[model samples]
Target: AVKYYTLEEIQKHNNSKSTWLILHYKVYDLTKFLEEHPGGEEVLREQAGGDATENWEDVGHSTDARELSKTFIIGELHPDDR
Candidate 1:
């Protein structure tokens, strides 16, 4: 099941002001991304702080984010097709 976060929580996390850049990336090789990220994956962990999806439209995030939205996979499951 997918868990959604609240807007307030997401906002709070976004405003956290970390020294590192916190980016929103859909899951790929999570372990790999986490290990390789410049700021560590911990920064993105806060994205789901409250259903960022809902607020995605409201925020003035760039069109690049929209492009990412189409490409990234969230809580997606891939069945074994072998």
Candidate 2:
């Protein structure tokens, strides 16, 4: 079964220290990914604790980036956000 997180829960992670993000309705904790991001930290921080689906996809992330992101996926977005 898939787990789900409410926006309130997602928002709580906003910050450089424990950043989380919603992309394509999936939840991801990108905290550890900050320093390693090829796009640099600011791009990720700009959408921390919020939906970055558009921005992420807009950048044309490769298939590898998609697969790499799976490692950080914590859950799905709340139904309300879907």
Candidate 3:
């Protein structure tokens, strides 16, 4: 499921909004897997811009399988902001 936070909320916190869809300017917080990634977090973070597909090729397609099967998410939406 995709979730969105307004500019004010996104500015104050680093959170995840269902890696399913991410915007162009938004900063993604992949802290959960950043440090432990086998390919190196730098690689992922380097591609943390508008289009991640080119840098992290096959990433978008790779999730299709998991999207249908996994229901658990690692992050939460900003709760303090309204």
Q: In model 2, which runs have C-alpha deviations exceeding 4 angstroms?
A: none
Query: Model 1, 1-82: lDDT tens per residue?
Result: 7533333333343333421111233222223234454544554454423334434455566876556444334332222210
Model 1 scores what on Cα lDDT?
A: 0.37
Alpha-carbon TM-score of each model against the true structure: 0.30, 0.91, 0.37
The candidate that wins on TM-score is 2
Better candidate number, 2 or 3, judged by lDDT: 2
Name model 1 segments beyond 4 Å from true. 1-43, 54-59, 74-82
**Residue 37 in candidate 2, Cα distance off native in Å:** 0.7
CA lDDT, every model vs. true structure: 0.37, 0.90, 0.42
Which consecutive 10 residues in model 3 have the weakest lDDT in total?
17-26
Residue-level lDDT of model 3, residues 31-75, one tens digit each, is: 565566566656655444233434444554356533532332323
The TM-score of predicted model 3 comes to 0.37
What is the C-alpha lDDT profile of model 2 across 6-70, one tens digit per residue? Answer: 98888889888899999888999989989999989988888998888889888898999889999
Q: For model 3, what is the error of residue 3's alpha carbon versus the real structure, in angstroms, after optimal superposition? A: 2.0
| C-alpha lDDT (0 to 100) for residue 49 of candidate 1 | 37
Tell me which of candidates 1 and 2 scores higher on lDDT: 2
How far residue 45's Cα lies from its native spot in candidate 1, in Å, is: 1.0
